[PDB]
Amino acid sequence: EVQLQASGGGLVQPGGSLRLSCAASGIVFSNNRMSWYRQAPGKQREVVATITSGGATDYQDSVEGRFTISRDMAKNTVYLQMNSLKPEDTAVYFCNARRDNFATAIYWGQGTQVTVS
Amino acid sequence: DVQLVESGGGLVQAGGSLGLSCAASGTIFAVNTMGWYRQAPGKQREMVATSSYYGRTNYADSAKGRFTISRDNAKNTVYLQMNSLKPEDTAVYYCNYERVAFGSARETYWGQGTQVTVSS
Amino acid sequence: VQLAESGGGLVEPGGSLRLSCAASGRIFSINYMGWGRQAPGKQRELVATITSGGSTNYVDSVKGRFTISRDNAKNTVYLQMNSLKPEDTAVYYCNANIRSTPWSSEDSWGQGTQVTV
Amino acid sequence: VTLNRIKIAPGIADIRDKYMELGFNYPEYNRAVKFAEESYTYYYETSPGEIKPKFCLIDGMSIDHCSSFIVPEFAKQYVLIHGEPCSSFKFRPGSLIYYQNEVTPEYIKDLKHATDYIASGQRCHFIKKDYLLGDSDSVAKCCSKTNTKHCPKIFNNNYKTEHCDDFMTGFCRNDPGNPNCLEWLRAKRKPAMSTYSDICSKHMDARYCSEFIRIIRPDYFTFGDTALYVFCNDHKGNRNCWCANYPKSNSGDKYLGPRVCWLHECTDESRDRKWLYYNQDVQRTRC
Amino acid sequence: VELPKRDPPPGVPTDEMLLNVDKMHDVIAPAKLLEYVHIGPLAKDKEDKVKKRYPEFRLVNTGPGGLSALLRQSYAGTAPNCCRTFQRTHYWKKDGKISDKYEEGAVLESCWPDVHDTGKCDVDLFDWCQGDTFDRNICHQWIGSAFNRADRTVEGQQSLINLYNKMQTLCSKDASVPICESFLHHLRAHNTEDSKEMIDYILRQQSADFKQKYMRCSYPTRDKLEESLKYAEPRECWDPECSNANVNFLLTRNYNNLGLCN
Ligand SMILES: [K+]
């Protein structure tokens, strides 16, 4: 069964840092595009970071230069390093895996809470 | 000039852990490379772990798997979490702030160094 | 590098015009292409731009009425000004941000055509 | 005051050394003054590093009489400097009067103030230096390696000093494929690399510009990049300028930097690296 | 009463004695510091004319009959006439104007031997390469010479460090200026992390207007970023704003990802 757990969130101050983790089961990073999304309380969800099957990463213009997405397919674990956090980054962060060349084969995962004050 | 202040070294048991911190103050210029180097008695100053302004980490073979370098550019601080320490790690640890201009000139500033003494 | 402009004139409020700018001369490449106007006694201001990839950006005072476009053939840039208002009275210049060399750029402007409303 | 006995007596050891026997009406001035007359054609150095012919160059006498005792081919690397004060017979100019026995300089002054039989001057003193250039043609012949016969080391050292650069800048613009010009370019000095950038901005199609690009990269790629841009901005129809200046449309940077690895013609094609910019050439290998 | 007359042998001049300083302007000019240049015999009536022609040289009287020489004592080449060129090592100045070839009545002024390797040209070319006086060739080559400045004298590396700092500051203010675009191009050519990170820093310290016009590949819109997830390939191989963005204003991430296409 495909499952995407999420953890690593917590409470920090303006300028803190966090590291979110997501382990995989039944999904190989060799033919999947991984993505870290965030959804603010009562707002449309937006993608924070994405990584291709070949390790090519991309970021949103706001979170660029601060957040960094990495992966480890030997352990089936995608990460997110949130450096220089801001109170606007407080949202529910969750992972999404979409198969290469299969737009209909897309799976979502659990979410984690982060906050800045 | 630039002043580096170390803090966090002391006495630790075998397989223990210890954290070092280096604070840079003065005429910083953003992009730079800050790191930790060790010096044992009678040996030469060798590299422990260096990190760039954006986190390009470079670990020595002795440090891989045990030590972890981190960096907070907001406060211009570099940290080193040393885990599973061994008696061979007993040394004076200095931090360096290196700035390479045009790949030709180098400006390296060192700190006074903190003593780490790992017992069994 | 020369920017030949046309399409300006005198029209009543609520009308429509189309400005056209032809870039002639040895041009290596283009960063962005834009239109700029200048009211009497005020500074020249860039009202609409389009990059080499076809991405457009307008000023709020113009958004909704004017549309900037480019024809790759003849390499011309057009400004479809619709729903004109007497506040649009200005000398409209043609802005061409070229890349003079593979290591430098140039911000060349035009002579300017008068548009009174 | 008045002379009444003059004679030339032979000498010992040296044929040049003779003795001018002088006897005047007043025996007060009356001496056998030893004088030398140089008769050698020097092909060697008297003392180490210098040549001192036994000749007293009198004041006002032309300085070519000192060098009339040296082999012409030998006297080219030698310069004439000031010499020790000497005296010569006015009726026999150029003689070197030796101060020996009672022939004191005070007696020379007395002879001067009493008779015009003497004239003062300085000893011929040549010292070795090196070949002396004297016009632009000599520098041209030395630097171009076309006549390195009489050429000092500063203008004859395979372009290892900043002497011939001024001439070579203009000389290689008429012959860029010259082996000596390419050797001067391998010195990797600024005037040579900028001169060859000016050359290759107009004649990049040649093969000496291929050699120039292989010489400057990766240490001084900028000159070759500027020359390539100028050449491909003037020659836009060339199939070789297709990567450095995309002719179609107004986007001539279609294959710059990483985008040079897209079109296969800019990576694995039979085209020299001179047609790609430095960033293009580096991205071609890493991709 | 009869004097033993005997005229001296016929004189034969040497190469030194047939020299004319009025013909050696291509021999005195390339002379280095403290190098004697024999100019042959020189009359007193022409002393000042030589001294006024070569003010960087001291006129010394080597031998008799006017045998003189010129010993270099200075390099009076001004910074504007020496730094904005890469092959003009000397010039002549008549009245107020400067020529590169000799003219009658002109005065010789020579540039420093390796002046693009000492740092003496950093101050002049930093201001000259800003504004309307920018040169697409000279300034690019000067920024390139800065990366290959073979000067390990403490003063030279200190001057190039100061120049590096001034460049970082100026390009953090506005990277669209031509000198800063050339600086970013040379930093990309350096191909080291120390240069890639400074490229990314300078590009990230730019205004929103700079990014909405030059950096539209590195900072995509919400719609393009959302649609890029629908494709397995990197967005750089898909976004037209990447295929058309100039390489000098790309982040190292996108600069590297563009190499993954094909
Ligand atoms: K470096």
What's this model, at a glance?
With 117 residues, chain A is mostly beta strands.
CATH fold name of chain B = Immunoglobulin-like
First-last Cα distance of chain D: 104 Å
- The H-level CATH homologous superfamily of chain B, spelled out, is Immunoglobulins
- List the total number of helices of chain B: 0
What is the ordering of alpha helices and beta strands of chain D? EEEEEEEEHEEHHHHHHH
Strand content of chain D: 15-25%
Q: What would CATH call the architecture of chain B?
A: Sandwich
Largest interface chains and counts? D-E, 80 and 71 residues
Category by helix and strand content of chain B: mainly beta
Membrane topology (chain E): Single-pass type II membrane protein
GO biological process, one term (chain E): fusion of virus membrane with host plasma membrane
Organism (chain E): Vaccinia virus (strain Western Reserve) (VACV)
Subcellular location (chain E): Virion membrane
Structural features, described:
The complex is a heteropentamer of chains A (117), B (120), C (117), D (287) and E (262). Helix content of chain C is 0%, strand content 57%. Chain C has strands spanning 2-6, 16-24, 29-38, 45-51, 56-58, 66-71, 76-82, 90-101, 104-108, 113-115. Chain D folds into 2 domains: 3-128, no CATH class; 136-286, no CATH class. Chain D contains 8 helices and 10 strands. In chain D, 39% of the residues are buried. In chain D, a hairpin with a 7-residue loop joins β1 (3-9) and β2. Chain E is α+β, with helices and mostly antiparallel strands and 262 residues long. In chain E, β2 and β3 form a beta hairpin. The longest helix of chain E has 20 residues, at 154-173. Chain E is rod-shaped and about 125 Å long. Chain E starts with 24 loop residues before the first helix and ends in a 5-residue tail after the last helix. The A-E interface holds A 33, 35, 46-47, 50, 52-54, 56-58, 60-61, 64-65, 98, 100-101, 103 and E 200, 204, 211, 218-220, 222, 225-226, 228-230, 232-236, 253, 257, 260. The complex binds potassium ion. Potassium ion binds next to loops of chain B. It is classed as viral protein. Keywords: poxvirus, viral fusion, vaccinia virus, mpox virus, viral protein. The assembly is pentameric.
Please write out the topology.
The complex is a heteropentamer of chains A (117), B (120), C (117), D (287) and E (262).
Chain A: E1 3-4, E2 11-12, E3 18-25, E4 32-39, E5 46-51, E6 57-59, E7 67-72, E8 77-82, E9 92-99, E10 106-113, E11 115-116
Parallel strand pairs in A: 2-11
Antiparallel strand pairs in A: 1-3, 3-8, 4-5, 4-9, 5-6, 7-8, 9-10
Chain B: E1 2-7, E2 11-12, E3 17-26, E4 33-39, E5 46-52, E6 58-59, E7 67-72, E8 77-83, E9 91-101, E10 105-110, E11 114-118
Parallel strand pairs in B: 2-11
Antiparallel strand pairs in B: 1-3, 3-8, 4-5, 4-9, 5-6, 7-8, 9-10, 9-11
Chain E: H1 25-28, E1 36-41, H2 47-53, E2 57-61, E3 67-72, H3 79-83, E4 90-94, E5 97-99, E6 107-110, H4 122-128, H5 138-147, H6 154-173, H7 178-190, H8 193-204, H9 208-211, H10 222-228, H11 240-244, H12 252-257
Antiparallel strand pairs in E: 1-3, 2-3, 4-5, 4-6
Helix pairs in contact in E: 5-7, 7-8
Potassium ion is lined by residues 100, 103 of chain B.
